[PDB]
Amino acid sequence: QEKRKQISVRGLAGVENVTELKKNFNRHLHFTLVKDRNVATPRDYYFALAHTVRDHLVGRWIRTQQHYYEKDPKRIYYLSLEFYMGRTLQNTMVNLALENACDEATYQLGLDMEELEEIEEDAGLGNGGLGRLAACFLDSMATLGLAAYGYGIRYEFGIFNQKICGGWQMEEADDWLRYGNPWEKARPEFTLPVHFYGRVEHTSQGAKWVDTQVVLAMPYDTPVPGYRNNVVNTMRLWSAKAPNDFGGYIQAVLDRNLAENISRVLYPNDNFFEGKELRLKQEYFVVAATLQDIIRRFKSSKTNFDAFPDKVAIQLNDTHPSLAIPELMRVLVDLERLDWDKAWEVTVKTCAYTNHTVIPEALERWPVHLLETLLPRHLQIIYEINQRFLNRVAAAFPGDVDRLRRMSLVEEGAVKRINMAHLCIAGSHAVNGVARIHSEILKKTIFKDFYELEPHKFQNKTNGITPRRWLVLCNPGLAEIIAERIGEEYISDLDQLRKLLSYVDDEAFIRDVAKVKQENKLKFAAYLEREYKVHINPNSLFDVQVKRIHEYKRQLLNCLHVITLYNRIKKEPNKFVVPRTVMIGGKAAPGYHMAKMIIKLITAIGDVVNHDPVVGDRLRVIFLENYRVSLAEKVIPAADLSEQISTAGTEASGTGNMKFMLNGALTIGTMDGANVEMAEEAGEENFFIFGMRVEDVDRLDQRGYNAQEYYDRIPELRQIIEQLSSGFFSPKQPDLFKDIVNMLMHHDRFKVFADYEEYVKCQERVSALYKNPREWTRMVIRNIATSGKFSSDRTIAQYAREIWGVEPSRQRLPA
Amino acid sequence: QEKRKQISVRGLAGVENVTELKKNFNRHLHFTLVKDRNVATPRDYYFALAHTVRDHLVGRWIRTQQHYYEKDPKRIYYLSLEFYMGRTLQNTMVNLALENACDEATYQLGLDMEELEEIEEDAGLGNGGLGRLAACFLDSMATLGLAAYGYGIRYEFGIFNQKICGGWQMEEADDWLRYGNPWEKARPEFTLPVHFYGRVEHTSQGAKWVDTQVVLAMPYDTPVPGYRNNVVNTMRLWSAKAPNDFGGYIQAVLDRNLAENISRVLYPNDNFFEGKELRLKQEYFVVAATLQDIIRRFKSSKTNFDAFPDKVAIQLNDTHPSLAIPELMRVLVDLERLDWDKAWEVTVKTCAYTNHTVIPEALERWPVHLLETLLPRHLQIIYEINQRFLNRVAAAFPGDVDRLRRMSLVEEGAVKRINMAHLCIAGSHAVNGVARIHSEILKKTIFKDFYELEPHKFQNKTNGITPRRWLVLCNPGLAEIIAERIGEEYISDLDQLRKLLSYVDDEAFIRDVAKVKQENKLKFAAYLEREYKVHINPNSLFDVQVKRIHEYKRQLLNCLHVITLYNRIKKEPNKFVVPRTVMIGGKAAPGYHMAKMIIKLITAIGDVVNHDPVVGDRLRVIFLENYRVSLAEKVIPAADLSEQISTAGTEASGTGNMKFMLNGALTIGTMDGANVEMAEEAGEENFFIFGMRVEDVDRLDQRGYNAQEYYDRIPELRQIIEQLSSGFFSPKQPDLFKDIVNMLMHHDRFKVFADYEEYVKCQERVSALYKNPREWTRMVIRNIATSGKFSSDRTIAQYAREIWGVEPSRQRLPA
Ligand SMILES: O=C(O[C@@H]1Cc2c(O)cc(O)cc2O[C@@H]1c1cc(O)c(O)c(O)c1)c1cc(O)c(O)c(O)c1
Ligand SMILES: O=C(O[C@@H]1Cc2c(O)cc(O)cc2O[C@@H]1c1cc(O)c(O)c(O)c1)c1cc(O)c(O)c(O)c1
């Protein structure tokens, strides 16, 4: 479009810059793609543009890394099993100020750059929140000029591609590397050995881990550009490779696949613990290879290990990389021959742990038999850690035997296990939750004993989202009308959005905020037609719940509300209601029967609602297939209403909530996770808060939750349960939803019925405000204006000052 | 070196060409390798040079392929399971005239280009002769301006890397793609489906192959540059990929490995038949993907199929791609719905078959049960082919029932099999052997019945070697002293080497030929020290036997001779003998116990000979480890004597014989394969011919070979057998060589003892001529001078005119 090149926030199309970009595009098309414009497909054109844009990172990537070598600042290592990065082309162009120059260059070559962007595969190397947080954090650490390295696994297959067939989830391999990855640089020369199995012999010098099987770890380095500060940091992802040397010769060559299977695929369980050996191998693989890099980089700097914590921070994203603690002790004691006590002092000052959930089924509790087989030295070191840790508990709390049993790294039972969260707290100088309410819940419930031993360890770091991906990239319309009033500094100083409260009565801004949402809604609706032949009413309220499918997130409560709207229309057909397009999307874990049945119930409700001629365009319900970072960038800027309806106490933070607030949706939600802080920043008068508070949930748990009480007292609820139970939503198979009905009536841990009436009444308040466009938009302005706290720059600046001990900086390197 | 830049055959170092090469080298080092000269290793420098040289292919590669589209000449498809390509960097620089310019460019950057060349991995995608012939053929077809495409498999692992440990072969995976392949272009956009298993339903339109498992075939295209004619042809290698859509989700993602195992590794059996299902899958994979390309390319040209043979030749390199015949019939009949008879007329005019051995254990005879399971439609079509073929035999030879049984594609027995050689002859308009004697042996023995039915089918095409790789690349010294007298035209017109017979009495040339061999011997000896701490006497005769280890090649006869020289020294220590360095190298098939014992016997003989202080530097025996194309380019130009000592009738052609003749070694050999034609070209007076002729072997077979007769009549032979038997060469394990002794005495199919006395006497004639340097060199001149027939340009020109029906051309395209 002509209009989009006019957007100032997208930078300058310098005449020489355009000329060079076209020359380099054509050069890559010829020498890199080995095509000419005769045979070139849109995919060749995307790749020619990606190689051209990637060439602009290289000088800064080399200069940044040389700068870290020269200045020797403290290095931050962000260890994660997941980096939900999404696409790279737009992000690179935004962060290097090339967006308008590439748009003009490709326009002059007769190409639509927006069409080329849609060709790129997501780097879908995460499940959801925790993975996307890692991605926002790498972006913020680069923008803040930290010497920061993401370390993870280069999965051959990311989070599965979700197809919906017959209204059911089907899973397909996410072959994201099919056409190559133009961003990464293979570093086979920096390949490192990782050891498994074997046994411990305790010799003269001490212990020795021998008779191991070797898997090599080959690093692939991806650039991470800061926002217009010429900083380019590194994400290093390890790929598994069979060792050089060794059924027959042929079978031995094919058996190289077993070692290489370690980096084959992301576990799609959204943090729910499965105890798979292959998952333990992935966790050890990332930790072992990463810590060898850290130790090597430390020794080749301006061996004595007292300075190690002054030069190294290791941030553990959940317990997934918790083996970092025993592995660093193994390296320091067995290989560097430090005394246990010195090694432990170093380890604890180096390591910090971030907890992302209180849900007990998320907790990693590895069988000791599995650890003894796979990692015999690690289990010895863990027992030693536990003995010395519990000695300290006994000394602080003499005779508190119950506290010793509760705090032990070792869990007794049929199967003896190691609690990896207890290991993380024992081995870390800082433990943080990811929202104020969550960090308090840690100190009062699941880590109370640890808090009483070492209160100074416990911190809060409220999550955030990068305002580059989550406003400038995905919503350039909104970024522009904001820049037109307060300039561009807010893009890396998001608290400046508070200036927008000066505009709540400004006729032009009220007009502009509503026009941007309408433009976003027209574009998203076009898509739902062009690529899925699905019609949506563009004058309807876009009611959006997008996140992984879990009972705790209560997609089912949204289902009860949708059926309530259908049933109220059928009862009073002549009564006006605010038209709604209810959009639910998200992946279910491939096992999880209940999650898959919930997806089927959403599509089944659609089958009835969407074909009822009495309803027509007044209510539509659509399951958004294959929800992922790229789709989030499309639907979130188009949303009117943000569904954040987890049972109070279950969602640690959320980050999708923050994306919606930044992009001009109003929120309906419980007082859970960061929804509490979002309501506080904006004022509760500007949020649709409903339902039980954490205290209310605890009171119900104390007397026992009886779903029958709610069914017996709420006629509209009885009608819906009777429709699901009798087969109104599955006439060819009347018993289809019996398991959902049985769970809701008898085994509902997330108290869906207890929030049903407050939810429905809150949703009437949403409709009532939507009927007043001007007042809807003024409340939106009050939300966008107060979304600044939820920048990951704020979050990372807190990690840097309160945990890592490094001072952030927005000052530019040269180019 | 300063001297090597002076070599005119290596071309011009133009000042602007040098300037541009350095600029492009530095550009690739920065943008492609993402390094600077601070951290760059020799391997980064090799890759920067390879990308720079590869950029020079691209325009010509695109223009050549556009030219074939424009002119629509008949296309030649060379189908092979093997392309033994070796390294590409030097070959590319020679064929584009860039060698001196890159040498000067890298010299000016402070680098040694020869050192960078040694970093490149061989593309070791073959076993030996047949694979290397495919590689010489692609080079010759490009040099002759044919519209020719090599089609094969992109094996992840080529021919195993051979280590020698304890004097034994050990096999390691040839991870040739570890650091990437800068030559190939991945073409994932041109990926094609290949079908396996399933069943045939015979419907209204006719047969339909349904319920199949799909494996995708992803092509990788490698450039094949002609010699200074601006032609760049394509080698397309298929890689196996799991189909996009589908133990659990995780196991299903890991199970993608089973389909991908099809292209994992080259079968290392040097043509010996094993009947492995995975090998049958590889053969079908290459044929099915290739024939879809051929059919598509045919339909998109200037559907009617009568012109198909005028636009397509398919050359079958051995029976490995024999399924091309039933697959083309399947496509034409089942998918294009041609009548059987029209389809068959097309298939036979399209297909031709090259036979590479008479040894019955090489013959592919697939169980019908395996074909019925894997390829049910192919087996139906093969039976139909057989019925109609045998109908024709019955009509030509009425009542010859024995001939029907002998000629059938179907072999009866405990296990019913398909004879793939019989299928190839039935389905091909031409059948060729690879040397005059071999092609006659085919018409008189194993294909006599087929010859009597269709004599016009049977041709000879004597093998050849490319004089680019096998003289200009590997022996620039020799190429230069030749160019100094007759100019450069001989490099693509090798018959011009006959001009050198004018120089047999030229003092300067005699001096120069001997100086080049000495320079080659000094360089090879340096290597045997620098990279293996092995000392060799540079004034010794370099006696070289390099080829795959097989009983038929009689490395054991060479062993008997070496022990004879040792025993004669010990008996008369004071008697002068011509010092020898006896070098034997080659890979044994990983199964093949006897081949592995023969390697151990060579190293064991070395252990005694090389440490006997009475022998000292008068006799040394070394096993050259990991013999492969790159090592052949080093040892062959250094050789004095070429060992070509196969039992008469067993070696179809040989090509290593031709390499040695071209590079100034004299030959000791039997009248076998192309040794016969080499002796004819040079004159037998200029070859060390010995032993039984084919007629002599047949006479022995008629009365029965009794090794005992030879043992009883030859004292020197008895002494050696008694040394092997008693444990003289294995004192710590006296019975080590009992199996070799038992085979030689009782089960020797290759009549080693029958050629022993003539071999030893012939070797005395070699020593006697070596004592006269001037006469040795004059006989070398007479060999090099007559080596011109053995150019693969001569061979390919015969294929083009006598089988493919296309006229070759050495005329230049524009650049
Ligand atoms: O459906 C349209 O886009 C799709 C939806 C969409 C969105 O909701 C937000 C966003 O950030 C990008 C976005 O890209 C989508 C898209 C898909 C394509 O296949 C494509 O070629 C393209 O240009 C784009 C569309 C229709 C239009 O009529 C149009 O003019 C346009 O620019 C775009
Ligand atoms: O051993 C030397 O080379 C090795 C043997 C050899 C050969 O026999 C023929 C040939 O075509 C090339 C060839 O490359 C070998 C080689 C190996 C290396 O590791 C290397 O760095 C190199 O420059 C080369 C050598 C010694 C020398 O003293 C010397 O000056 C030289 O140029 C080379």
Residue numbers in the entry:
A (entry chain A), B (entry chain A): 7 to 252, 260 to 315, 324 to 836
Provide the publication's sentences verbatim:
Glycogen phosphorylase (GP; EC 2.4.1.1) is the enzyme that catalyzes the first step of glycogenolysis toward the production of glucose-1-phosphate. GP is an allosteric enzyme according to the Wyman–Monod–Changeux model and, through effector binding, adopts two interconverting states, a low-activity (T) state and a high-activity (R) state. GP has several ligand-binding sites that can be exploited for inhibitor binding. The structures of rmGPb-EGCG and rmGPb-EGC complexes were determined by X-ray crystallography, showing binding at the quercetin binding site (QBS) in agreement with kinetic studies that revealed both compounds as noncompetitive inhibitors of GP, with EGCG also causing a significant reduction in cell viability and migration of U87-MG glioblastoma cells.
Κinetic experiments with rmGPb and rmGPa showed that EGCG potently inhibited GP Ki = 49.8 ± 1.6 μM for rmGPb and Ki = 46.7 ± 1.4 μΜ for rmGPa, hence having similar affinity for both muscle GP forms. The QBS is located close to the protein surface about 15 Å from the active site, 43 Å from the allosteric site, and 32 Å from the inhibitor site. It forms a groove constellated by residues Lys544, Arg551, Lys655, and Tyr548 on one side and by Glu120 and Glu123 on the other side. Upon binding, EGCG makes a total of 107 van der Waals (vdw) interactions (14 polar–polar, 39 nonpolar–nonpolar, and 54 polar–non polar interactions). In addition, 2 water-mediated bridges with protein residues are formed, namely, O02-Wat1037-Cys495 (O) and O03-Wat1134-Asn541 (OD1). Aromatic rings A and B are positioned in 4.06 and 3.20 Å of positively charged Lys544 and Arg551, respectively, forming cation−π interactions. The gallate group (ring D) of EGCG forms 2 extra hydrogen bonds through its hydroxyl oxygens (O37) and (O44) compared with the nongallated EGC, with residues Tyr548 (N) and Glu120 (OE2), respectively. Superposition of the binary complexes of rmGPb-EGCG with rmGPb-EGC reveals a shift (RMSD, 3.31 Å) of the Glu120(OE2) side chain upon EGCG binding due to its hydrogen-bonding interaction with hydroxyl oxygen (O44) of the gallate group. In comparison to quercetin, EGCG having an extra ring (ring D) forms overall more vdw interactions (107 compared to 63 for quercetin).
